[PDB]
Structure formats: structure tokens, C-alpha cells
Paper text:
A major challenge in the further development of nucleoside analogues for therapeutic applications is access to scalable and environmentally sustainable synthetic strategies. However, NDTs are mechanistically distinct, forming a covalent adduct within the active site, thus controlling stereoselective nucleophilic attack of the incoming nucleobase on the β face.
To gain further insight into how the presence of a 2′-OH substituent on the ribonucleoside donor influences substrate recognition and subsequent catalytic steps, structural studies were conducted on the wildtype LlNDT-2 and a double mutant Y7F/D72N. To explore the structural implications of the differences between the two enzymes, WT-LlNDT-2 and the Y7F/D72N mutant were both crystallised using conditions determined for the WT-LlNDT-2 enzyme previously. Complexes were obtained by soaking cytidine 8 into the crystals. All structures contained two molecules in the asymmetric unit, constituting one third of the hexamer routinely observed in solution. In the case of WT-LlNDT-2, electron density in the omit maps obtained could be clearly modelled as the ribosylated intermediate, and the cleaved cytosine nucleobase, whereas in the Y7F/D72N structure cytidine 8 was intact, presumably reflective of its poorer kcat as observed for CtNDT. The interaction between E98 and the 2′-OH alone would militate against the activity of E98 as a nucleophile for attack at C1′ of the substrate; additionally, the even lower activity of the Y7F/D72N mutant versus the WT-LlNDT-2 for ribonucleosides would be compromised by the removal of the interaction between the phenol of Y7 and E98, which may suppress the ionisation of E98 for nucleophilic attack at C1.
Residue numbers in the entry:
A (entry chain B), B (entry chain A), C (entry chain A), D (entry chain B), E (entry chain A), F (entry chain B): 1 to 157
Write the structure that this text describes.
Amino acid sequence: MPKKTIFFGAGWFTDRQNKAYKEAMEALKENPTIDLENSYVPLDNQYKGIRVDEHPEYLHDKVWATATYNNNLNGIKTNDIMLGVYIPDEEDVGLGMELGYALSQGKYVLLVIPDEDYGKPINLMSWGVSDNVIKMSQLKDFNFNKPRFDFYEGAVY
Amino acid sequence: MPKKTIFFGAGWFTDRQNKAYKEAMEALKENPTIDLENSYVPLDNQYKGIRVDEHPEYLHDKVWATATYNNNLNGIKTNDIMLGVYIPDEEDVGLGMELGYALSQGKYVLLVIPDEDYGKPINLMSWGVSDNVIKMSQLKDFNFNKPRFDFYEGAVY
Amino acid sequence: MPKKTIFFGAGWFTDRQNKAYKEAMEALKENPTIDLENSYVPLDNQYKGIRVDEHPEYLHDKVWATATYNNNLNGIKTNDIMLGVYIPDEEDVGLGMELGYALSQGKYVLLVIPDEDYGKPINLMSWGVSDNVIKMSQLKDFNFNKPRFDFYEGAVY
Amino acid sequence: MPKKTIFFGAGWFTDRQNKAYKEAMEALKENPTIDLENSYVPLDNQYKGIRVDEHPEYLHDKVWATATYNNNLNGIKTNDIMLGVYIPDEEDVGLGMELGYALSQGKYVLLVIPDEDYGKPINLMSWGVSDNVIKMSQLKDFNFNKPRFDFYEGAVY
Amino acid sequence: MPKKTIFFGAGWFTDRQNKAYKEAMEALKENPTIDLENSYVPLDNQYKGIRVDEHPEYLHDKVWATATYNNNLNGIKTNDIMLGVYIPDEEDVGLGMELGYALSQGKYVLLVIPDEDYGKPINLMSWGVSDNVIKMSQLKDFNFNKPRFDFYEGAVY
Amino acid sequence: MPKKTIFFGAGWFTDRQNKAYKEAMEALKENPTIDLENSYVPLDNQYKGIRVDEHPEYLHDKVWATATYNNNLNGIKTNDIMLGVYIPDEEDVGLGMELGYALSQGKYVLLVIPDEDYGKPINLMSWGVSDNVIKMSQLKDFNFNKPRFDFYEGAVY
Ligand SMILES: Nc1ccn([C@@H]2O[C@H](CO)[C@@H](O)[C@H]2O)c(=O)n1
Ligand SMILES: Nc1ccn([C@@H]2O[C@H](CO)[C@@H](O)[C@H]2O)c(=O)n1
Ligand SMILES: Nc1ccn([C@@H]2O[C@H](CO)[C@@H](O)[C@H]2O)c(=O)n1
Ligand SMILES: Nc1ccn([C@@H]2O[C@H](CO)[C@@H](O)[C@H]2O)c(=O)n1
Ligand SMILES: Nc1ccn([C@@H]2O[C@H](CO)[C@@H](O)[C@H]2O)c(=O)n1
Ligand SMILES: Nc1ccn([C@@H]2O[C@H](CO)[C@@H](O)[C@H]2O)c(=O)n1
């Protein structure tokens, strides 16, 4: 079984983000076509250790920001597949940027939406960058070695 | 006097977005380095001239979506400069994607924030993709012939 | 009145190609949004000014080929708009490659088909790379300052 | 033995295409550096099942075309190597486009020509996009882990 | 008379670099196809207006470096043509990187070599990235509206 | 243990280059995350055999140069990681070009500097293209499966 690495695109601000985060991570743990160990998970890759939760003064530090921004781009460009954990009611400008970067870097762009949310409207441009969008319950068995193009069965605005 | 064209990146989904939209458009009309006539305004380039909020029968039309998505990419790639009307409290996933696309197309990426909001934290990834960020009241006089890189006078989250 | 430059993508290997070539060139001469003088015409930019059909000693010259190939890429990348004079029944692999290159360089990709052939099926991949396709008789009046995406009024095979 | 995946670029219209198709497929089956299972073969990836042979009404469907076009680009961008089964007498605009896309996506671009045809003239731009061109009989033993640049020993037009 | 802008690629780290710098700048002032006013000159675009050789406190400032690096990339991407003032005996790693970046941004890459040095061997990779190379005394009259590919009249090492 | 391939970017002119070359090669031989066998080493990939050491007439041959230039680009684009063996006192325009190419091709760009030299000033643009710069003694244990962004702890000019 060949395995692909992913960039774990996902917010961690809100309760719905955190729930979807935990679920997507569990699905990837079960997916035999994913090498999670060698995948890039932003939350586990805080520059120089420094946790911004505990030291918010770093949010005005240009060096911290440059390094964190660059680490994210690096994580996208050096991994096989771009994953976007996507909450239709809580769409994220940062994830959006990353989707557009991933597109430019020639990566497959997979959005994953919670089953309870699948079908709800998403932004045209999110709809368009995506090569495919699936429900959370399909993530554990998605074949990342044979990724295909498909359309969201759902609304755009 | 050389003139550049822009892509008008902006949400139109809240009252603060719409207010910023109207102000930015007025500033561009007054800027002697911008050719607004030959610029791309997404809201005037929707497929078949139809907005999905005014004709919700198009919410699941895949042809309308494909064409509108593609028209936007074309608007970014064929114009000189990428503009992002940006509300820190109401950031737009669609604009984010477009910032990433613009970066891929080698365009200058200028964010413009209402004066009342300038200085407030913005998303890391918006901070990073952007080449520069200014107050709404600076847009009318910005020299688009000599565009330069600068850091936002403001924090990220 | 702003003017754009074009790369003149066109075969010259059949009578219908050559007829379309001559017509497209005449239309461009009359289009007030085109600067034809500073446009790239492949047939005037062959290495050492020599065409391989008139001097078949060059059929295996690797230097002539490298230079002519590279001159074409340079012609696409340094001009505003990619034009493809396109015969549905006599499609050209060389033009196809160039359509792909132009896409990579972020150029508007306009196919122009003789009126007598407009509406006939074209290759899927030509249909997709193209931003738009028009009849020969529309080329003289096309506004290259406001280029937009549209679907071919026609089938694919 | 590391293995690479390919996109199987090849027409299936004519008798010469079909013969070369069958031969190239057999060679890849024998090549220990190719993972054919996880490679993208357009003919086995018809969108939503729908075979256009049996339902030609889909050739005027914009959604079918968008999806099929995108599936092909996706198959090129997500695989390691671009293969072009190339018939000098029957050159294909669609394959051409794909070669240019593959180039832009940073892939090795390998043309394979039937032994009976190797040496016959090919288009300059096909000659140029290619990183290498080989005879059909060399495909089964080509080392895809150590791909090199070389010139076609043959004519261009 | 159409005018193009340039990025002024040049070292300033030896006497021969500086002499070539001054000569190239004078030639550009006289070239009727160049808009020098709206061109990017790296030495006038250092972050905070400070040169590290005049203020060595900035030798380890990561913010100064990030901004100056980014300003240069922006200068290449937003101007029409990439110029490289090139000393065969004193080749510059920084300019080299920029040649590669310019290639990525689809810009014409023109090297200009002092007359006294024109014809001397240059690095293979400089020879290859360049679209063309000329003598300093040709820069004042070069037609930047019709830029073409040519091989250096000179060797590589 | 997954393994990545590299392009071995390094000069071989001077005594310091040759020493660093030998050391970097030995470190890669010891690194379990590198597949050196399938990596691209320019010095072992002389076109058509022809060694330029022994036949310097090839330095004025345009075909030799085209092929060697292209083989290098091909070696960068088809491998996972770009390595630059970097001597601060002897910076190389060719390596510079390759770094910029690698960046454009979405590769991780790792500079490696001799321990005796680590901390010495390097060009701004080398500092910027790099995703990371390490000392020679860290190369044997660098985890190429989890590459990260970091800043040189050293001077720029
Ligand atoms: N402080 C921050 C803010 C944003 N991010 C990146 O941006 C996405 C969420 O906006 C996430 O996918 C994440 O990669 C980050 O890493 N750190
Ligand atoms: N229905 C829609 C939705 C989005 N957009 C594009 O995306 C941004 C707004 O999210 C805008 O910047 C716009 O380009 C659009 O054009 N039409
Ligand atoms: N001998 C040749 C052959 C091809 N071409 C380029 O490719 C297209 C014609 O196939 C044309 O669009 C042209 O750019 C060329 O320039 N010279
Ligand atoms: N109806 C069609 C037409 C074309 N193609 C793609 O284009 C190439 C042949 O033109 C082939 O390589 C194939 O990928 C396709 O998939 N379906
Ligand atoms: N301190 C520095 C060092 C380098 N540069 C850029 O890189 C080239 C000179 O190496 C120049 O072409 C210039 O663009 C710079 O701008 N500032
Ligand atoms: N004659 C030459 C000259 C240069 N090179 C490539 O350029 C880098 C050193 O300049 C090296 O990294 C090497 O790839 C080459 O291969 N052959």
C-alpha cells in the first residue's frame, strides 16, 4: 500500500472547528493510504516552541509571523495532498488562502465537511479551487492514491 | 501618466463589506494611476449577468458556478494588480482564495481596510500573502506604478 | 485607447490553415485594441530567418530547433494575449502545446474559428484550456481590454 | 524498487492509435519502475460511468465536459510522470495541450513513438516540450526513477 | 511609443560591478523604449532606506532581510523585463537567484555585459536562463517592445 | 522509513568546494531518509559521456550546453528536495539560478554550509530563497520527511 502525506488545513477557534478537527484527525488515523506521521499539522509545529496561546505578545512580532507563515506554505508545498476541514457556517480566510496556494503548487485539493453540514452553501471560490468535496464519514476510506475530480453536491453562494 | 488595471476583490455579504466596497470603488474612480473602466469587477461579471442571491434557482447550477469561477480567475490573471477590500472582523474565504491565486499569477497584492478598522489583527495567511496593506483613505492617492512591499502596521491572529 | 499585444498561434500546414491565417491577420490589422506591430508572429521569428520547409537541411538541426522553440515560448510569455487560429477538422498539436504553455503563463487564451466551421466539435482539452472562442468575423471588433470567459457555442469530441 | 505513477496520454480514435495504445500499456505492465495500478488512464476514468461512445448527447453537456477536462488535468498533476503515446502521422491537439500542462506542473514529459515510426518528423513544439523521446520497444525497460533529458533522433517540422 | 519597465539586476560589491552598474543606468536613461522612472532599482528599495554596508547593525536583522528580500521579488514580478548587469569574472549569486525567479514569473531575461568582457565564458545556468545577452553599448538602443531569444556569442564554463 | 531524492547542487572548482562536496556526499550516504541512488548528481550525469575536462571544445557547442542545462533543470524538477552546498566566501551564480528554479518548482530548498564557515555572511537572496540553512555536521541526521522552515543564524549582506 503506497501512502501519501497531507497538509492538515483546519481552524481551531470555535467548537464546530474543534469537533471537525478531532473527527478528521481520527479518520486520517484509520486511512491506510495516509502517512499521518510525516504529514504537516500546523498545531504541532509552533515555531521555536513558543505557544501564542500562552504568549500573545508574539502576535506583533514580525519574525514569528514570517516564520509561521512560511512554515505553513512549506508544509503545503512539501506534502502530497491539501486537506481542508471546511465548516460552511464558519468559513476561514486563512484556509482560503492556503487552498489557492495549494492549487498553484499542483496539489490535489480535498475539502471535508461534517456530515451534519454537507449540502450547506459554500463560497463559489471554495467550490472552484476544490478538486473534490466529501463528507467527514468518507474520509477514513478515501483512496488518496487514486484522487479524482468531482463536484460538491450542495449549494454555492 | 501610466495607468494600471485591478481586480476588485471584495465581499458583498454584510453591511460593513458593502460600505467598504462602495468607498473603495469611489477611491479608485479618483486615483489617476488606475484605469477603472478596463478593470474587473466581479459583481458585473457574474455568468449570464445573474446574481445567485437575486435568482436562487442558480444555487445548484454547476454551469453558472463553473463560468463565474472561471471568469474571476480570468479577471485576476489579465489585470495588473490584485485588490482586496478587507474587513478584519468579517474576513472572506473567497477573497482569501483569490489572494492565493493572485500570488500564483505574480500580481501585486494590496489589501485595503476601512480607517475605523485599520490596525486591528488580521489572519496570519492574509498578512503573509499581502505585499502591502493600507487604510481606505489612502486608496485614492496610492501610486500603483511604483508598488512596494511593506508590513501591516497591525497584529495577526 | 489602450492596446494589447498577441502571440499569433496558427498552423500553416494546410490550405484551410493558411486561409484562416491570412483572414485572422487582416482582422488584427483592423482591431483598434491590438498593437500588431509589437505582436509576435512565429513565421517571422524562425531562427536565422529560415523556414524548415524552404530549407530542409534544417530538419535535423538541433540548434535551429532549440532557438525557434525558445523564441516561441518567449513570444507567448512577453505578449498580453494568446490567440489560437483553430481549424476543428485540422487541429494542430503545436498550437495545442502553446495553449497549455499560455495557460501556465497566466494569459487569456482566445480561439478563433472560421465562420464556415464555427459551431463544429473541437477537442475537449482545447475547449477547456480556452477562456473563450469566437468566429473569424468577430476578431476585428473584439475588445481585448475587457477579455472575459465564455463557453464555446459548440460541441466537444 | 521505488515505483512512479504516470498519466497515460494517448488517443484511441484510429487503428494506429489503438495499436500503439495496446503496446505502450503492455510495456508499462512489464516495467518494474511503474505503478500502473495507481496511474491515471483516461479511458478507465469516464465521469459518472457515462460512456460517450454509447451516449453522444453528453458531448454538448457543459458539466460532463468540465468534469472530464478537470479529471484529465487532475490525473496529470497528481501523478509523477507524463507519458505521451505519439503518432507522427496522426498528431493530437489534445495530447499537445496536456504536454504543455504537464510541463507547467513540473513533470517529466516522455514521448513514446512506435518503432516503425521513430525518426519521422514531429512538430517543433512537441520536440521542445518533451524532456525525452523514445521508441516503443524501450518503454518496458525505461528507468523512471532516473529520468534524463535527451533529444529525439529524428526530424522536426 | 510604448515603454516597458525593468528590474535593475546588478551587484554593487566590486569596482567592476559598480562601473557596469553606472554605465547600464546611463544607457537605460537614453533608451526610448524604457520607462526608468517606474522601474525598480534594488539599491533605492532597501528596507527603511538603509544599506547594510552603511549600517552593519542590520547584518543580522531578520525583519530588514525579510522586507528587502520580499521587495526585490515584488520588483521583479511587477515589472516587464528582467535585466542582469553581468560580470563574467565576478558573477553574483544574488543576481543568479533573481534570474531563476524572473524565469518563474514569465519575464524576458536580458543579460548585459561590459564591452571589454563581452564574449568571455559565463556560467552554464546563466547562459540557459537568459533569453538573450548583449554588450553594454547596445543597451541604450535595444528594442524592449520586440524582445527576442538569442544565444550568447560566447562560451560557457 | 520513507526516503526522498535530492538534486545535489554544488560546485567542484575550488579546494573548498571539493572538500564540502565530499563531506556533503558522505553525510547523505549516512542519512536514512535519503535515496542517494535515485538522486541527481550533476557530475555523474555528463551528457553523452563527453567529459568537458578532457574535451573543452564542447564549451562552445550549443547542443552540449542546451542538453547539460536541461539535464540540470530536469534533475531539480524530478527530485523531491533541492540541496545547495554553499560556501559563503565562494558563492556561485549557477547554484543561485538553481535555487530560484527549485523555488519555482515547489521544492524544499536546503542550504548546507561547512561548520567552519557557518555564521559568515551570505547574499540576501540566498538567505531568502532558502527554506532552511544548516551546518554540514547536521546533514547526516536531517529528517527529510519532516522538512521545516527556519532562518540562518548568521549574517546577510
Ligand atoms: N496563528 C495562525 C493563524 C492561521 N494559521 C493557518 O491558517 C489556517 C487557519 O486560518 C490554518 O490551516 C493554519 O495553517 C496558523 O497556522 N496560525
Ligand atoms: N457569487 C460570488 C461569490 C464570490 N465571488 C468572488 O469571490 C469574492 C467574494 O467571496 C469576490 O472577491 C469575487 O471575486 C464572486 O465573484 N461571485
Ligand atoms: N516550424 C514551426 C512549427 C511550429 N511553430 C509554432 O507552433 C505552431 C504551429 O504548429 C505555431 O503556433 C508556432 O508558434 C513554429 O513556430 N515553427
Ligand atoms: N473525449 C475526450 C477527448 C480527449 N481526452 C483527452 O485528450 C487526449 C486526446 O485528445 C487524451 O490523452 C485524453 O486524456 C479525453 O479524455 N476525452
Ligand atoms: N543587500 C542586498 C543584496 C542583494 N540584493 C539583490 O540581489 C542582487 C545583488 O546580489 C541585486 O540584483 C539586488 O536585487 C539587494 O537588493 N540587496
Ligand atoms: N559546466 C557546468 C556548470 C555548471 N553546472 C551546474 O551549475 C552549478 C554550479 O555552477 C552546479 O550545481 C551544476 O548543476 C553544470 O552542471 N555544469
